[PDB]
Amino acid sequence: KAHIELTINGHPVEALVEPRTLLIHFIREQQNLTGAHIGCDTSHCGACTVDLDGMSVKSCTMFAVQANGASITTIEGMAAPDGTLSALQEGFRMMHGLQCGYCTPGMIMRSHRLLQENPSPTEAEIRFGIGGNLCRCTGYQNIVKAIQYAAAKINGVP
Amino acid sequence: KAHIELTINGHPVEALVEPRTLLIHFIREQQNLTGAHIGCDTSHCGACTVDLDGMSVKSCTMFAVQANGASITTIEGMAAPDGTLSALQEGFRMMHGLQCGYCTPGMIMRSHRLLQENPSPTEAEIRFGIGGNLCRCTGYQNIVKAIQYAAAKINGVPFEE
Amino acid sequence: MIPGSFDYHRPKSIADAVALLTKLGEDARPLAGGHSLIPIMKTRLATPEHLVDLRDIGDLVGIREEGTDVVIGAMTTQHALIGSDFLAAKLPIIRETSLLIADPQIRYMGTIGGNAANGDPGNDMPALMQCLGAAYELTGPEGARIVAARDYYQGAYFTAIEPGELLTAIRIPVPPTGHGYAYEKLKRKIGDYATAAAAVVLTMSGGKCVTASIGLTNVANTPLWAEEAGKVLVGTALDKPALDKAVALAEAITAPASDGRGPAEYRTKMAGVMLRRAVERAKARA
Amino acid sequence: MIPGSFDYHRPKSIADAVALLTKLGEDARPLAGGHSLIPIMKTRLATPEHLVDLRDIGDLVGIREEGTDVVIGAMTTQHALIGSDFLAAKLPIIRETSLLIADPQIRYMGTIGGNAANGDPGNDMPALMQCLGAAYELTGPEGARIVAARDYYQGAYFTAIEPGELLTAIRIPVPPTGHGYAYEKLKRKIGDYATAAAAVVLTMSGGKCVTASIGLTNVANTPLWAEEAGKVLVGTALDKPALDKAVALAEAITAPASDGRGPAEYRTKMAGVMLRRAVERAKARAK
Amino acid sequence: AEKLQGMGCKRKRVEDIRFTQGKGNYVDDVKLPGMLFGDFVRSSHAHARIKSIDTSKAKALPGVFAVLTAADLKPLNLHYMPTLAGDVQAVLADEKVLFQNQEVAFVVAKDRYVAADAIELVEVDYEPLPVLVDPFKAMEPDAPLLREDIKDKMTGAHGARKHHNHIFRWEIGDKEGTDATFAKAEVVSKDMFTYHRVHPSPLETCQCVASMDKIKGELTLWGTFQAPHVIRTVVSLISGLPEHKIHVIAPDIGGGFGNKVGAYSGYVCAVVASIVLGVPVKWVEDRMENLSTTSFARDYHMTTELAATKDGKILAMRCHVLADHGAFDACADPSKWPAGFMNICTGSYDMPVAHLAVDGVYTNKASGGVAYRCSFRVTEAVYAIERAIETLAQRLEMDSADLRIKNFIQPEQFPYMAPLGWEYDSGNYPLAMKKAMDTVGYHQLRAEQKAKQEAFKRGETREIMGIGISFFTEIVGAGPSKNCDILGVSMFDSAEIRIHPTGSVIARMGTKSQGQGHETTYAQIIATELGIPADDIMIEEGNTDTAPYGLGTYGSRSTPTAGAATAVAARKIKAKAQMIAAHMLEVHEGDLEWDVDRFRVKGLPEKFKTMKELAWASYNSPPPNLEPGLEAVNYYDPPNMTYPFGAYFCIMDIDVDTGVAKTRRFYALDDCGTRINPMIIEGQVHGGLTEAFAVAMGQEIRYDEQGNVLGASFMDFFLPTAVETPKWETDYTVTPSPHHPIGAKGVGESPHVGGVPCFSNAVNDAYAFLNAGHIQMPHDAWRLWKVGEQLGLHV
Amino acid sequence: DSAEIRIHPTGSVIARMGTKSQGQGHETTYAQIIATELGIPADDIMIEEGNTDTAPYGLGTYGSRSTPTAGAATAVAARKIKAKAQMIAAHMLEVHEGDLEWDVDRFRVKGLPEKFKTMKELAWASYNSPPPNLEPGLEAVNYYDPPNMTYP
Ligand SMILES: Cc1cc2nc3c(=O)[nH]c(=O)nc-3n(C[C@H](O)[C@H](O)[C@H](O)COP(=O)(O)OP(=O)(O)OC[C@H]3O[C@@H](n4cnc5c(N)ncnc54)[C@H](O)[C@@H]3O)c2cc1C
Ligand SMILES: Cc1cc2nc3c(=O)[nH]c(=O)nc-3n(C[C@H](O)[C@H](O)[C@H](O)COP(=O)(O)OP(=O)(O)OC[C@H]3O[C@@H](n4cnc5c(N)ncnc54)[C@H](O)[C@@H]3O)c2cc1C
Ligand SMILES: Nc1ccn([C@@H]2O[C@H](COP(=O)(O)OP(=O)(O)OC[C@H]3Oc4nc5nc(N)nc(O)c5nc4C(S)=C3S)[C@@H](O)[C@H]2O)c(=O)n1
Ligand code: FES
Ligand code: FES
Ligand code: FES
Ligand code: FES
């Protein structure tokens, strides 16, 4: 087993892992951060998306040993330390951007990076920008609203 | 922390413990064997009794480090692998020797050793022989019956009524 | 979903990675972005005993202009290609292509060298690189060598690389300023490998095509360079008759798979349609 | 319930234990059965920095006949005392006394040397050892010495032991064959220290008491050897008038505590009743 | 006022708080002490005898605790399990395999990594048998004998048992009358419409955690169950454990879409393994196994005919279906309905007579049928009729909107007995059709289309325009005890509501959400009924120990059944509160009137008692006539189904040269009666229209001649992303259900039921001027290219 | 105090009360009361107390009150179930309720003892074929306001 050290949601983590352990299983099983989900076995759905060193990554398509030294944010990390929801979390609720909730962690983690890439996206930019994330429940329309709502809130803060 | 290796309920155990950790807390908190209970802070009640190298021990009055190399049985270790309860476990149910159940693990673990010390005890020998174990619910009378039942079961013949 | 066990290595340098690959042999595979290899390990179609992760090798990442070429390190990500305004000024077809590959997550990880080396005819970069007449720089235990992209692909997962070599960079001649370009892809949805796609670069003068080069994606067991189809455009006004000729010559070399994207006959025709549409958009650009 | 932290040591020999206790000073305590020490650590009445566990010293456990004595190693448990056929033959008062100490679990762990060394006037062994005229063998950094049990106890938790020393064994002169003996304890329940208790060993010939010795438990800040009370029995028939004299001489050296067991006056009187009863039972047993 | 958030409010969802923070509790999130992981060795063959299974290398592997085969199950009589259709399905294959990826052995290991290693070590020896995948051939005299466990060879149709591959024949309607009409009608319009096999593909796959507590003799089973009480009862009947010792828990479920109604082999094997080992056993399937081994949807081949006058009056409908059920009939349905409610296929139209026949057949494929927002085969019924309307209209040279308008059941005809036996509750079809046509500018679209067609013929454009129409009548809320039961349990549902002394509420229902918002919306019903703010009400479902017995969530039945029970239970509480108020105010109950959140004395509106006050009084000063406290239960047996309806219009543009279709506009009018939460309904519609788009335009599961399952992964199975999914335009009318306690109809499946015919009708309409005929779904690019290729459009 | 009793389709029972045992055997004895009232073996009944989300509201265990209060409620709630069961039996046997007599665990037709329905059969029937005037299922609650103390 390999010894890894990394940061998840601002906290140091150290672990001994088999190289073949997928990062999504390390997060869910060893770290007990069960927000991130698995929706497929071919890398299409994006339910396992995390933010890793400034990137949106499908954590089912990376080994935990590749994340050695990384800084990872998962959905558990998105709320403020006082409990206050992020703009994206709030937007998804206000705009009815989720139903069963299963894609939601990955959608919000992807969208967190999208609004850093492009803080003021058009609808076409939003749809393309979340092209790696599948949802079965919403038909995407309210997800676009949620992202737009969040961008407006963020753009108001400063 | 101190490194310890022992046997509990027939299984090898390896652990790290602070020297001051009481055995009762190692068993409950670290091993998650929560059958043993704490009923006092002065070593009177016996609710923490375990069987340790052939002795009945109040695990609240021993450090886990003292049990390095030992063999312990707790109440979880009493039933057979085939599901079937020990003679004592069965006798406590048959004779209504428990109510709240809080003393019962310690009573059964004491009684397990008692019946090895003395396989056919008199009533007075039973009462004396569990003197280190308090019960609040039963008034002891049915506990004595339970231990008599178990003895008669083990021995294949009854003794006193 | 679950891969077989392997040992994991992080060499510090090209030399160390080539030494490892050479020593461990067939049972070791380079690991770049992992977004083709890890999926086939998870199905256990691949069961390598060792992975040699190229992540710590800084010399494998980067975009520079060297003489009349742009040289791109093999570990440069799709996201980085898209982000390079320097690449967009010189080789704008790369951005256009890269935006048609996979999805944002995959593009953060997937590399240009992995896309080139992988050997899946579904990959988009191979035929683009054939269209651009790129060269692949390979380094192994016997030293450096160069293989044209046009000569690199023999079949599905069969390529010109040898045991112990890494593809370390891609060297791309820079087209003239004002060249036309297009990458036109037909697919079932975001992320899908092409039903058919065409890469075109061309130059014009006085209403006539002076140079043209065409690549075809995922319409054979390899990428294809449509040599004859590009030649027939040269000297023409890129009008109907000329396009019909190029389409014929391009269709003629296809040999597509019949799969969920449709039967081979459809995909042959789609290579033609993509080619027409790409030439038109290139023409307008030029 | 929770003790303060400490470092834990398991010396392999008496010599090593003594070297440790000497090196570490008052911050280190020997750990025997732990059934007085651990309870007071748990209340933080005792906060030693080091516990020197004697368990790996095989030399400290045992019952040996040597010369005209029995020599009992300090780590010998109460349970082992009770189970000894040899003690039951030569010193039957020990079994009788042990079975009046604590409870089965505590007796599996608690040791004779810890009972003797502890210094609590509630312990039963001290006055029994005074009755029997036992000697305590101590080993320390300056070597071996012997202190009569009759001289070992100066006050509550105040004994003749010196820094670095361990009580290693108790040497008990074997009483004559046919001696009488008794330990008579008054207590509130199983496990309770005595309201009062009396240890008696005596011998008889031809209707008359030849020897007598009396110890009194938990009726002063130490055990007591009731020297004059025993002396006044010698020569008598151990009848009510003789006993009246012994009782007066015994009561007169008591100085009990007033606690939940009752007022001091009650406990003094109970010492006298326990004495009468112990003498009567020892008389019957004699021959 | 601001706090009530009752009926009609766009109340924001209470579930979202936990789900947006990763604090949902889905099955794979569960971790129990000692819990192992199990998964299957699966068949590489579609049809073969099993000669031998060698498990010895797998058992030997460190970290492997058990490898079950059918030999371990038999003695428990658990090598087959019952289905909802009244067949049985193999749990682990015994003598033979019958579909590719069928379960053959169950490996139980320390974790899912070791399990996967050990599966690859098991060696199965097969002997190939001839594969049957074409249902049109299933009842030929030389068709393979699949189901050797239940059937003997029977090669024709006139023996004392049906053909060995024939599952059932079901017929309904007036055969003689229908035949007589078709014999004399001026126009007879016939087509064979295939509704191709697809799959519900919930983003979370099927999974469970079984925990047999051997010390207590009690089983806890966490799982992905749309009907957790039904699963308890089934587990009881098959295991022999009594219901009070089986604790089923359906926690948060990551979508169901019908995939999670029935039992699967993984549930049974986890349970058996846990019983054997005495520790918990988790089973979680991967996507490729979900798609290829759990409930498929559709696979009906519908020979559909309408008889009409030349002026467009529909005289009769005659429909015969060949249903491909795969290897075992596991099709979820009420027990008396083997083709579900396919007998709603006369749709929105007033026809005198009709006749329907359905034949089910076995093939070498996964089981299922009823899934993916089908409402029990109403998807298929609506497709049949709405496609038949269009092909009839073509044959009549009539505009199909006008043909519908000529034939609609009129509002005054409700309740309407339709000619295949359902009595429709309420509907205003002409008003909804008009609203829709006006909104989309229908007649102007047709003129635009005609001009575009002329341009196409002049060589001026390569794009063609289609106008899809789907006017549909749904049937949801199964259902009355007379004819609706699941394995002998009548299809009621239930609610229990308990008001605490300080006026907050705990309520539970016998349904189970998989994202439809129940935890938000059931509280809105109670809030309006009792005047108690919705946030003061906790809703729970899915724990069989605690929730009242119900039949689960499927058939858009939650609002018809448990929503009704909720209202009726609330009204029991209200009635008891009225008696308490009468006692407190010293009046007769008949002197009181309810006013939002209080009872007032008629004429002395000053005198009143609030619901909050009455709740406290029920505990503090209970009237001596009455029991203390304030709670109620209702188990609601519906008098009829509810029949929501819709009018959907799609404008589609198609590039004939590539086959690529692009939706221009999609307008969806739904009328589900009283609307509890317009925000939630809108979301349900968005989701269902996206499914409809997927099914009509790309999704499929296929089988080749060797029985290999094709396209059963996200490499091929078309799930749209945000890029492909159209924008949706939604609208409504409100036509309450007369019999429902709050007038509310189900709606969740409507968008898919109506949406698929809308899309397919649009594609078919685009090509109608070129005489393409019926184009079979899906309408992906290669297939629409082939349409044009065959019409000569490319040369 | 209070009791809620729910009979499952296959005839076992979950019942909860508003008291809370600390060793007095409620989990055993409340089932005994139900068993006699309903003719369902005690072993087929699960008793729970102490989870305020699930148990009906009660005032707890003290004052030796459990038998007087919840024990009364248990009997009363079980009699509500028996009364519903008698209605179901009458419907199934096609007689009047007053023609039925109870025999330990079943209703028999008076003078025709071969015509009977057991409680188990009635429980299934309540789910499978609810008589058209009744609700499905078979369960009841009682909150018992005692008329006096008991004076042992
Ligand atoms: C859902 C999904 C959709 C996708 N869609 C597309 C798409 O539309 N078009 C497209 O082009 N791609 C697509 N891809 C594939 C993607 O672009 C991969 O990133 C690419 O194929 C491989 O690059 P990589 O860096 O991830 O290589 P890896 O996966 O790390 O390696 C791939 C192979 O190349 C070898 N290799 C890698 N680097 C070197 C090197 N420097 N020298 C020699 N050998 C090397 C590896 O050993 C392995 O055999 C998709 C992938 C996913 C998961
Ligand atoms: C509930 C209960 C009831 C009890 N009832 C009685 C009773 O009725 N009568 C009675 O006599 N006792 C009673 N006891 C006390 C018991 O007998 C103890 O075992 C005894 O007092 C101390 O012996 P130990 O071996 O447990 O010593 P420890 O607890 O290990 O040590 C006690 C003290 O002696 C010192 N020490 C121990 N061994 C040596 C040595 N060899 N040399 C130098 N110092 C040493 C220790 O450092 C410590 O200061 C009871 C105890 C409990 C918990
Ligand atoms: N008149 C109405 C009708 C419904 N609603 C609200 O809409 C929701 C859906 O109610 P209903 O139509 O009764 O449907 P069910 O809750 O019974 O859902 C079942 C249905 O739900 C569908 N939509 C789904 N949506 C999600 N997110 N997940 C699934 O698994 C779903 N599966 C499908 C399939 S398949 C089916 S059968 C409820 O919150 C309800 O209060 C309303 O506000 N007013
Ligand atoms: S689980 Fe589907 S992309 Fe990772
Ligand atoms: S909210 Fe259910 S998959 Fe997106
Ligand atoms: S807890 Fe009371 S003797 Fe141990
Ligand atoms: S059974 Fe309650 S303390 Fe003994």
Rg, chain F, Cα only:
16
Tell the residue nearest (CA) to atom 31 of ligand 3.
E257
How far apart are the C-alpha atoms of C159 and C116, rounded to whole Å? 10
Q: Which residues contact E311 (CB under 8 A, 6 or more apart)?
A: none
Residue D35 assigned ligand-binding role: yes
Note if E524 is an active site residue: no
Which 3 state secondary structure label does DSSP give D246? Answer: helix
The CATH code for residues E376-475+642-795 is: 3.30.365.10
Instruction: Give the up-direction half-sphere exposure of residue B42: CA atoms within 13 A in the CB hemisphere.
Output: 5
How far apart are the C-alpha atoms of C48 and C150, rounded to whole Å? 28
State the Cα torsion B146-B148-B152-B155 to the nearest 10°. 110
Shared fold status for E376-475+642-795 and E476-641:
yes
Subunits with at least 3 CB pairs below 8 A relative to chain B?
Answer: D, E, F
How far apart are the C-alpha atoms of D170 and B132, rounded to whole Å? 27
Where do the domains of chain F lie?
1-149
Residue E397, Cβ density class (10 Å: 0-12 exposed, 13-18 middle, ≥19 buried): exposed
Q: Are residues D35 and D94 in the same domain?
A: no
Yes or no, beta carbons of E724 and C190 under 8 Å apart: yes
E390 contacts E767 by C-beta, under 8 angstroms: no
Cα maximum dimension of chain B: 52
Nearest to F97 by CA among F133, F124, F73, F129: F133
Q: Locate the DSSP E strands across D190-230.
A: 196-205, 208-217, 224-225
Which of A37, A56, A58, A110 should be mutated for ligand 4, with most atoms under 8 A from CB?
A58
Pick the CATH number of E199-295 from 3.40.50.10470, 3.30.365.10, 3.40.640.10, 1.10.10.10: 3.30.365.10
Cross-strand pairs, D70: D65, D172
Count other Cβ atoms within 10 Å, centred on residue D232. Answer: 21
How far apart are the C-alpha atoms of E191 and E306, rounded to whole Å? 9
A98 Cβ closer than 6 Å to some ligand 5 atom: yes
Q: What is the chain A residue with the closest CA to C80? A: A55
CA end-to-end distance (rounded Å), chain F: 19
E576 contacts E615 by C-beta, under 8 angstroms: no
Q: Which tokens in the block code for residue E290?
A: 């979900």
D59 contacts D68 by C-beta, under 8 angstroms: no
> Domain range holding C18?
1-54
Q: Which tokens in the block code for residue E19?
A: 């789900």
Q: Which of E269, E374, E484, E672 is catalytic?
A: E374
CATH number for the domain including C141?
Answer: 3.30.465.10
Cross-strand pairs, E663: E652
Nearest 5°: CA angle at E437, between E436 and E441? Answer: 120
Yes or no, beta carbons of E489 and F9 under 8 Å apart: yes
CA end-to-end distance (rounded Å), chain C: 47
Q: What is the chain A residue with the closest CA to E288? A: A41
How far apart are the C-alpha atoms of E305 and E320, rounded to whole Å? 9
Number of domains comprising chain D: 3
A47 contacts E214 by C-beta, under 8 angstroms: no
Q: Which residues contact E136 (CB under 8 A, 6 or more apart)?
A: E301, E322
Which 3 state secondary structure label does DSSP give E713? Answer: coil
Nearest to D269 by CA among D280, D256, D260: D256
The CATH code for residues E1-130 is: 3.90.1170.50
CA E148 to chain centre: 31
How far apart are the C-alpha atoms of E97 and E105, rounded to whole Å? 12
Q: Are residues C185 and C89 in the same domain?
A: no
How far apart are the C-alpha atoms of E65 and E108, rounded to whole Å? 6
Q: Which A-chain residues 100-139 have CB contacts (< 8 A) with chain C? A: 110, 113-114, 128-132
Query: For the residues of E317-340, what is the DSSP string, one character each?
Result: EEEEEEEE--SS------TT-TTT
Yes or no, beta carbons of E33 and B83 under 8 Å apart: no
Can you give the three-state secondary structure of A104-135, one letter per residue? HHHHHHHHHHHHHHCCCCCHHHHHHHCCCCCC
Q: What is the position in ligand 2's atom list of the atom closest to the CA of D114?
A: 23
Which 3 state secondary structure label does DSSP give C207? Answer: coil
Q: Is E503 left (phi over 0), alpha (psi -120 to 50) or beta?
A: left
How far apart are the C-alpha atoms of C130 and C217, rounded to whole Å? 10
Which 3 state secondary structure label does DSSP give E389? Answer: helix
Cross-strand pairs, E125: E52
Nearest 5°: CA angle at E683, between E681 and E689? Answer: 100
Q: Give the position of tokens 């139903």.
A: A99
Contacts of E506 in chain F (CB under 8 A): 53
How far apart are the C-alpha atoms of E293 and E310, rounded to whole Å? 48
E380 contacts E757 by C-beta, under 8 angstroms: no
How far apart are the C-alpha atoms of E324 and E346, rounded to whole Å? 22
Contacts of F25 in chain B (CB under 8 A): 99
C261 shares contact with chain E (CB less than 8 Å)? yes
What does chain F come to in residues?
Answer: 152
Nearest 5°: CA angle at F55, between E576 and E244? Answer: 115
Which 3 state secondary structure label does DSSP give E731? Answer: strand
Pick the CATH number of E476-641 from 2.60.120.330, 3.30.10.20, 3.30.930.10, 3.30.365.10: 3.30.365.10
> What topology is assigned to E131-198+296-372 in CATH?
Aldehyde Oxidoreductase; domain 4 (3.30.365)
Contacts of F9 in chain E (CB under 8 A): 233, 243, 489, 549
Q: What is the chain B residue with the closest CA to F24? A: B99
How far apart are the C-alpha atoms of D101 and D112, rounded to whole Å? 11
| CATH 3.30.365.10 for the F1-149 domain, yes or no | yes
Q: Are residues C68 and C40 in the same domain?
A: no
Q: Which tokens in the block code for residue C138?
A: 């390979």
CB < 8 Å & 24+ apart, contacts of C147-154: C149/C116, C149/C223, C150/C225, C152/C116, C152/C126, C153/C119, C153/C126, C153/C222, C153/C223, C154/C222
Which 3 state secondary structure label does DSSP give E408? Answer: strand
How far apart are the C-alpha atoms of E651 and E664, rounded to whole Å? 5
How far apart are the C-alpha atoms of E517 and E530, rounded to whole Å? 20
Q: CA of B16 to nearest chain F CA: how many angstroms apart?
A: 36
Q: Locate the DSSP E strands across A18-157.
A: 49-52, 55-58, 71-73
DSSP state of C75: T
Q: What is the chain E residue with the closest CA to C1? A: E286
B120 contacts B127 by C-beta, under 8 angstroms: no
- Number of helices (H) and strands (E) in chain B: give both, helices first: 5, 5
Instruction: Detail the residues of A annotated as belonging to a binding site for [2Fe-2S] cluster.
Output: 40, 45, 48, 60, 100, 103, 135, 137
Cα maximum dimension of chain E: 91
B53 shares contact with chain D (CB less than 8 Å)? no
CATH number for the domain including C188?
Answer: 3.30.390.50
Q: CA of E197 to nearest chain C CA: how many angstroms apart?
A: 15
E214 shares contact with chain B (CB less than 8 Å)? yes
For residue B91, CA distances in Å to B9, B87, B102, B132, F82 come to 21, 6, 17, 20, 37
Q: CA of B54 to nearest chain D CA: how many angstroms apart?
A: 10
How far apart are the C-alpha atoms of F31 and F44, rounded to whole Å? 9
Tell how strand D143-148 and strand B11-17 pair up: unpaired
Q: In what order do the strands lie in the sheet with C180-186?
A: C180-186, C196-205, C208-217, C224-225
How far apart are the C-alpha atoms of C271 and C185, rounded to whole Å? 9
What values do phi and psi take at E791, rounded to 5? -95, 5
Cross-strand pairs, C211: C203
Q: Which helix (H) or strand (E) is C225 found in, with range?
A: strand C224-225
Tell the residue nearest (CA) to atom 34 of ligand 1.
C118
DSSP state of C194: P
Yes or no, beta carbons of F22 and B101 under 8 Å apart: no
Nearest to E169 by CA among E322, E5, E23, E22: E322
- Ligand nearest the Cα of residue B142 is 7
Q: Which tokens in the block code for residue E181?
A: 């009409």
Q: Which helix (H) or strand (E) is D243 found in, with range?
A: helix D240-253
How far apart are the C-alpha atoms of D178 and D210, rounded to whole Å? 12
Q: Which helix (H) or strand (E) is D130 found in, with range?
A: helix D125-132
Q: Which tokens in the block code for residue E666?
A: 């999609």
Q: CA of D78 to nearest chain B CA: how many angstroms apart?
A: 12
Cα maximum dimension of chain A: 48
Contacts of F29 in chain B (CB under 8 A): none
Residue D164 assigned ligand-binding role: no
Contacts of A66 in chain C (CB under 8 A): 34, 53, 55
Which of C116, C146, C174 delimits the end of a domain?
A: C174
E41 contacts E104 by C-beta, under 8 angstroms: yes
Which of C9, C27, C54 delimits the end of a domain?
A: C54
C199 contacts C223 by C-beta, under 8 angstroms: no
The domains located in chain A, with CATH, are: 1-77 (3.10.20.30), 78-158 (1.10.150.120)
What does chain D come to in residues?
Answer: 287
Query: What resolution in Å is listed for this PDB structure?
Result: 1.3
How far apart are the C-alpha atoms of E131 and E124, rounded to whole Å? 19
Which 3 state secondary structure label does DSSP give E361? Answer: strand
Cross-strand pairs, E308: E187, E314
Q: Which residues contact C222 (CB under 8 A, 6 or more apart)?
A: C121, C126, C153, C154, C155, C156
Which of D122, D147, D174 delimits the end of a domain?
A: D174
Q: Which tokens in the block code for residue E517?
A: 């918002």
Residue F107, Cβ density class (10 Å: 0-12 exposed, 13-18 middle, ≥19 buried): buried
E272 contacts E68 by C-beta, under 8 angstroms: yes
Which of C6, C20, C35, C139 should be mutated for ligand 1, with most atoms under 8 A from CB?
C35
E149 contacts E129 by C-beta, under 8 angstroms: no
Q: Which residues contact A158 (CB under 8 A, 6 or more apart)?
A: none
How far apart are the C-alpha atoms of E652 and E663, rounded to whole Å? 5
E203 Cβ closer than 6 Å to some ligand 5 atom: yes
Note if E373 is an active site residue: yes
CA end-to-end distance (rounded Å), chain B: 52
Nearest to B37 by CA among B78, B8, B76: B76
Nearest 5°: CA angle at E714, between E712 and E719? Answer: 110
For residue D118, CA distances in Å to C270, D185, E536, F94 come to 98, 20, 64, 87
In C105-142, which positions are buried (b, 16+ CB within 10 angstroms) versus exposed (e)? bbbbbbbbbbbbbbbebbbbbbbbbbbbbbbbbbbbee
How far apart are the C-alpha atoms of C30 and C51, rounded to whole Å? 6
